[PDB]
Subunit: 98 residues, 3 copies
């Protein structure tokens, strides 16, 4: 019944860069992630209407957000996409923090 | 990298109304959006054709956007969820 | 002009074969609606789930998005607990705002 805080990233980028983003999550110690495929978009939160986009959802301890955004920075300065950081609550924070 | 507050809308509606919804985001000054397609769902009318439009906007654009979506959602199925999020800028 | 009200939003990620178990818990608790994102992929503690590799589309990971009043969170999580102790998946609880509490409560 008790809930514990965590952060949740939504990383939206072109499907061709999936391996780069998942490798970056794995190296930072992220314990898991979910990928929503076949997304489409327009502009900037630029995306072309024909781009095959994905959204990577990653629940992470707050201590990993800074290093992850620092890792995604050179990528997002040269490629389309974004990272949305959410506050979430989970019942079992051990599943998400090493 | 500094974190900045934003609002993130999740607008869930029938795919047949996509153009109406994206035109309204365009006309309000929303700079970009992402669409999650081919959704299923349960609502007050029955089961499901549905899409989810994700837009991260400054808080000042929330009110005008909801005011724009109001006649639509008073006559059509669909929901809007407003989230508080943070985004990092260099 | 449009008043906003607080609500909670669950994201429930689980194997598609368990969709009915999850939607039945939501229906029973009085959840008024839900949205399902299908054919997902993901990395779990014991391996990868790749939706596009499944022979039956219904077996792929799904994410059930459910906006619920805060009072339904505890009973729902209590229901999901034995399931997630024996099956793959996660539940993320978010704070959101909505314009029409009656549509959800
Ligand atoms: N940290 C996380 N962030 C986002 N999604 C996650 C996370 N951890 C798990 N998931 C999702 O839950 C699914 C199942 O994870 P898990 O329960 O650890 O599975 P298993 O142990 O059987 O491999 C993952 O494939 C992923 O879709
Ligand atoms: N409580 C809810 N949580 C998540 N999605 C919802 C909820 N209520 C409605 N929806 C979505 O909105 C669609 C239309 O519902 P409605 O406006 O009640 O006809 C549903 O089929 C779902 O996809």
């Amino acid at each position: 019944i008790k809930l514990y805080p965590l952060k949740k990233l939504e990383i939206i980028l072109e499907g061709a860069h999936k391996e780069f983003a998942t490798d970056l999550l794995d190296r930072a110690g992220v314990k898991g992630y979910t990928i929503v495929g076949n997304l489409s978009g327009k502009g900037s939160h630029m995306f072309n209407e024909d781009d095959a986009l994905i959204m990577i959802i990653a629940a992470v301890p707050e201590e990993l957000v800074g290093p992850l955004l620092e890792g995604f920075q050179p990528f997002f300065e040269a490629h389309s996409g974004v990272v949305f950081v959410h506050d979430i609550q989970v019942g079992r924070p051990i599943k998400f923090r090493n």
